Enzyme design. Structure first.
Site, PDB file in Angstrom:
ATOM      1  N   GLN A   1      10.863 -59.132  -7.264  1.00  0.00           N
ATOM      2  CA  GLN A   1      11.138 -58.745  -8.637  1.00  0.00           C
ATOM      3  C   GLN A   1      11.170 -57.235  -8.823  1.00  0.00           C
ATOM      4  O   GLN A   1      11.691 -56.774  -9.834  1.00  0.00           O
ATOM      5  CB  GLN A   1      10.096 -59.345  -9.576  1.00  0.00           C
TER       6      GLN A   1
ATOM      7  N   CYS B   1       8.256 -61.513 -13.647  1.00  0.00           N
ATOM      8  CA  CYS B   1       7.681 -62.653 -12.927  1.00  0.00           C
ATOM      9  C   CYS B   1       7.900 -63.974 -13.669  1.00  0.00           C
ATOM     10  O   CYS B   1       8.164 -65.008 -13.044  1.00  0.00           O
ATOM     11  CB  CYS B   1       6.186 -62.422 -12.694  1.00  0.00           C
TER      12      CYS B   1
ATOM     13  N   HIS C   1       0.177 -62.957 -14.112  1.00  0.00           N
ATOM     14  CA  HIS C   1       1.288 -62.979 -13.168  1.00  0.00           C
ATOM     15  C   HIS C   1       1.755 -64.413 -13.014  1.00  0.00           C
ATOM     16  O   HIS C   1       0.968 -65.274 -12.617  1.00  0.00           O
ATOM     17  CB  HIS C   1       0.842 -62.395 -11.825  1.00  0.00           C
TER      18      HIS C   1
HETATM   19  C1  LIG Z   1       4.322 -60.738 -14.862  1.00  0.00           C
HETATM   20  C2  LIG Z   1       4.886 -59.909 -13.701  1.00  0.00           C
HETATM   21  O1  LIG Z   1       6.063 -59.564 -13.715  1.00  0.00           O
HETATM   22  O2  LIG Z   1       4.068 -59.619 -12.775  1.00  0.00           O
HETATM   23  C3  LIG Z   1       4.567 -60.129 -16.240  1.00  0.00           C
HETATM   24  O3  LIG Z   1       3.791 -58.959 -16.371  1.00  0.00           O
HETATM   25  C4  LIG Z   1       4.358 -61.173 -17.354  1.00  0.00           C
HETATM   26  O4  LIG Z   1       5.303 -61.835 -17.741  1.00  0.00           O
HETATM   27  N1  LIG Z   1       3.126 -61.338 -17.863  1.00  0.00           N
HETATM   28  C5  LIG Z   1       2.850 -62.317 -18.908  1.00  0.00           C
HETATM   29  C6  LIG Z   1       1.584 -63.103 -18.594  1.00  0.00           C
HETATM   30  C7  LIG Z   1       1.688 -64.159 -17.491  1.00  0.00           C
HETATM   31  C8  LIG Z   1       2.768 -65.190 -17.800  1.00  0.00           C
HETATM   32  C9  LIG Z   1       0.320 -64.829 -17.375  1.00  0.00           C
HETATM   33  C10 LIG Z   1       2.661 -61.610 -20.256  1.00  0.00           C
HETATM   34  O5  LIG Z   1       1.965 -60.611 -20.352  1.00  0.00           O
HETATM   35  N2  LIG Z   1       3.289 -62.172 -21.296  1.00  0.00           N
HETATM   36  C11 LIG Z   1       3.222 -61.660 -22.645  1.00  0.00           C
HETATM   37  C12 LIG Z   1       4.343 -60.678 -22.955  1.00  0.00           C
HETATM   38  C13 LIG Z   1       3.923 -59.214 -22.944  1.00  0.00           C
HETATM   39  C14 LIG Z   1       3.081 -58.820 -24.159  1.00  0.00           C
HETATM   40  N3  LIG Z   1       3.803 -58.389 -25.352  1.00  0.00           N
HETATM   41  C15 LIG Z   1       4.692 -57.391 -25.444  1.00  0.00           C
HETATM   42  N4  LIG Z   1       5.288 -57.076 -26.581  1.00  0.00           N
HETATM   43  N5  LIG Z   1       5.010 -56.676 -24.364  1.00  0.00           N
END
Ligand SMILES: *[C@@H](C(=O)O)[C@H](O)C(=O)N[C@@H](CC(C)C)C(=O)NCCCCNC(N)=[NH2+]
Length: 212
Positions: free
Chosen positions: A19, A25, A159
């Site tokens: 990625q 992810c 993740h």
């Molecule tokens: C994962 C990666 O690419 O390593 C990526 O950081 C991710 O999608 N994280 C998710 C949580 C996982 C599915 C447990 C996440 O943080 N989702 C919420 C979206 C981000 C929070 N809000 C905003 N506005 N950025």
């Protein structure tokens, strides 16, 4: 269900992806499960577009993270293109699904595994690859080279990855950090520890596509 499952051995898993620095992810995780269920239901293994989910899932946040369940709902509501048609660029751009012709594959829904339940997750993995989440921020996970991983790690999941098998003491995970990480891109994570969160929080939030 059997003592060993490995969807790679059934030809239902495509090569390991990277990625990059983008927080995509959630899209990579979802695509593994689509590639798997389409092989299971149709006999054909294809690569599908992480970039399309990155660009087009309005509930997620592009390279700032996202939701496997929303990405899977997108494929069930509309569809997904082949990776070749919509290749991975590592940056969120405009949604270009409409410009790229008819969808290549479509699913019929999304289900959640009952959380914090090892057996329910194993049951789902025996039927198809499953999108799962874990805590990857710890340096032990980052530096993982091989073996059955027991941590150390907490349960602050961050993740999304894909469970593509299991054995008596582990669950087999396809990561999206390239083929030089772990066991040629995979990690086997210890199971059966009695911790309802799962090792590194592995049982926190698990989803899989439905296709008739
Ligand atoms: C994962 C990666 O690419 O390593 C990526 O950081 C991710 O999608 N994280 C998710 C949580 C996982 C599915 C447990 C996440 O943080 N989702 C919420 C979206 C981000 C929070 N809000 C905003 N506005 N950025």
């Amino acid at each position: 269900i059997p003592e060993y499952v490995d969807w790679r051995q059934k030809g239902a898993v495509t090569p390991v992806k990277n990625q990059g620095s983008c927080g995509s992810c959630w899209a990579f995780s979802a695509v593994v499960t689509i590639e798997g269920i389409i092989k299971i239901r149709t006999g054909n293994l294809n690569e599908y577009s992480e970039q399309e989910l990155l660009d087009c899932d309005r509930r997620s946040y592009g390279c700032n993270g996202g939701y496997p369940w929303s990405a899977l709902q997108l494929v069930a509501q509309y569809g997904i293109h082949y990776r070749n048609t919509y290749p991975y660029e590592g940056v969120q751009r405009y949604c270009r699904s409409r410009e790229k012709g008819p969808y290549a594959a479509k699913t019929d829904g999304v289900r959640q595994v009952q959380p914090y339940n090892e057996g329910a997750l194993l049951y789902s993995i025996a039927n198809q690859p499953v999108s799962v989440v874990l805590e990857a921020a710890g340096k032990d996970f980052q530096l993982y080279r091989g073996g059955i991983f027991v941590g150390p790690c907490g349960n602050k999941v961050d993740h999304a990855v894909a469970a593509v098998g299991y054995g008596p003491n582990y669950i087999l995970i396809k990561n999206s950090w390239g083929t030089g990480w772990g066991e040629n891109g995979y990690i086997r994570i210890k199971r059966g520890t009695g911790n309802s969160y799962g090792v590194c929080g592995l049982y926190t939030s698990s989803f899989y596509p439905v296709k008739n």
